[PDB]
Design an enzyme around this catalytic site. Structure first.
Site, mmCIF file in Angstrom:
data_model
loop_
_atom_site.group_PDB
_atom_site.id
_atom_site.type_symbol
_atom_site.label_atom_id
_atom_site.label_comp_id
_atom_site.label_asym_id
_atom_site.label_seq_id
_atom_site.Cartn_x
_atom_site.Cartn_y
_atom_site.Cartn_z
ATOM 1 N N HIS A 160 0.740 -1.307 -0.030
ATOM 2 C CA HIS A 160 -0.095 -0.101 -0.231
ATOM 3 C C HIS A 160 0.893 1.243 -0.076
ATOM 4 O O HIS A 160 0.392 2.492 -0.206
ATOM 5 C CB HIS A 160 -1.069 -0.011 1.222
ATOM 6 N N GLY B 135 0.258 4.801 11.999
ATOM 7 C CA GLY B 135 1.080 5.375 10.875
ATOM 8 C C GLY B 135 2.535 4.901 10.905
ATOM 9 O O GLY B 135 3.353 5.505 10.415
ATOM 10 N N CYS C 223 3.524 1.886 9.647
ATOM 11 C CA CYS C 223 3.402 0.763 8.868
ATOM 12 C C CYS C 223 4.644 0.167 8.200
ATOM 13 O O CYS C 223 5.570 0.962 8.237
ATOM 14 C CB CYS C 223 2.695 1.298 7.471
#
Lengths: 301, 301
Positions: free
Chosen positions: B41, B143, B145
């Site tokens: 992503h 946040g 990731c």
């Protein structure tokens, strides 16, 4: 909701841990430059620990009685010296893995990470607070003497604790890296009492701010109070008195949440008096006091 | 008494963390040998995330759209490939700090350490469990990731988790290092429900054994039960059913304490029904379920 204690990454400290053996006693050492720091009680027999004369005991020891290992390497002790309760073993090899570091003496209620080590080998990393009575709780350092507590700011490791002993109550006691004990303790196997422990009020307030930030706000009321009025309640529940320095420390969290520090103090006041009525805050059934305002700021911003 | 969650030393993982930037999106990558693993992503705009066709999106990207940094170094992406939900960025430089490692898929209820990282820079280390419903609680990876979960056995790092997303409920979801999501989740910004979460029964039992070991034994009663009778109560309080495999797993703790596993189950049964009456166990006001039998054995032996 949810809020986890976070330890600093331990990599920089891992590369400094060594094994120091003397007789049948093996404990952990800290290898910084050409010096290995460890508890002076490494030189004591089990008998010696009952009432040691460290000056006299140290004199009988020779360099070659100190077995210092870094992994599979054997570092030769070039010279041995005593600074308060810490032994300084001079070696001929500077640790190539020595990070930027400072020795610091922390205040009661502050937090740090401990790299728990057995015989010079890192086993795990813990986050903890120095209790107001200068002990550490958690039964995590048992027989792991010489393990160190630290904080990391930018590229610098600030060493603040070296584990020495469990008191008869099971709590941990230790020194700064200049070998000065935290609290009234001595490195001798005798009965020693820690002070009454108190709850770290500023930390509980920090944690409540954390709770608000994470959407868990049921405990917020529309009251305020003064430091004086709050501290009357605090003393009753064995909470550390709250100072203006503490209020000043909480300013950023007050500004982020739009909740005046004295208003948050009023909500704590109500929690102390009425309890939590079987409810949780950030997934905990009691008021957590091992997160500093700084810890909360770093994790929540 | 006291019992702290312990994370593995993070040093070996720290040396593998990199920054991967694509457009305005920067997240963490894992650099092992000449491959950098990260959430696929990273290639998605905020708009793209609403309903991404990753195959089609990946095709538009070129190597030079992937900014991979290791500290101050810039690693050139030689080739990019997609394995399930993880991007594999081939680079021309093998990580000299690559530890011995395996990729492993863990079971629900197991624990691991997470090295929380922001933009390729280690920030902290957490210990956590994979919930029975395949999420992670604690609001600690927001946040962050591409941060990874791991266990260390001997000299080997077993990577088991890569953080992808927060579900709308705030809980964390992610994949193994082959990019297969834990649980029914997908890497798309849509409403997704986690299963009913249950308490990890075997872990609670482990923790009670821990409590006994540390001298905190008020909850022990002189009853026993059968797996069947216990599991009737368990289902009522949303506890995972206890199997013979679980009982077998608890054997060493049963042997160390002299408390049969089914006897400990009887004490839990009573705690569930009557609560804790304002008392604590190992300093906690609720029953802790994020310590495995293995974790307890390692910390208490």
């Amino acid at each position: 909701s949810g809020f986890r204690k976070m330890a600093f990454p331990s990599g920089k400290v891992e590369g400094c841990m060594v094994q120091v053996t003397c007789g049948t006693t093996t404990l952990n050492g800290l290898w910084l430059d050409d010096v290995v720091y460890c508890p002076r009680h490494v030189i004591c027999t089990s008998e010696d620990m009952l009432n040691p004369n460290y000056e006299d005991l140290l004199i009988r020891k020779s360099n070659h009685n100190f077995l210092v290992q870094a992994g599979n390497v054997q570092l030769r002790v070039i010279g041995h010296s005593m600074q308060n309760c810490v032994l300084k073993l001079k070696v001929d090899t500077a640790n190539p893995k020595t990070p930027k570091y400072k020795f610091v003496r922390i205040q009661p209620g502050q937090t740090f990470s401990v790299l728990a080590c057995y015989n010079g080998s890192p086993s795990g990393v813990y986050q903890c607070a120095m209790r107001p009575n200068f002990t550490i709780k958690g039964s995590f350092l048992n027989g792991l003497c010489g393990s160190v507590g630290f904080n990391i700011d930018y590229d610098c490791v600030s060493f603040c604790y070296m584990h020495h002993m469990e008191l008869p109550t099971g709590v941990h006691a230790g020194t700064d890296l200049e070998g000065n004990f935290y609290g009234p303790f001595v490195d001798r196997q005798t009965a020693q009492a820690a002070g009454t422990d108190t709850t770290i009020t500023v930390n509980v307030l920090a944690w409540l701010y954390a709770a608000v930030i994470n959407g868990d706000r049921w405990f917020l009321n529309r009251f305020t109070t003064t430091l004086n009025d709050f501290n009357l309640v605090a003393m009753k529940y064995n909470y550390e008195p709250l100072t203006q320095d503490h209020v000043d420390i909480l300013g950023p969290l007050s500004a982020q949440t739009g909740i005046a520090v004295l208003d948050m103090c009023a909500s704590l006041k109500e929690l102390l008096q009425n309890g939590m009525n079987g409810r949780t805050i950030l997934g905990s059934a009691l008021l957590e006091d091992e997160f500093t305002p700084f810890d909360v700021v770093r994790q929540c911003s």
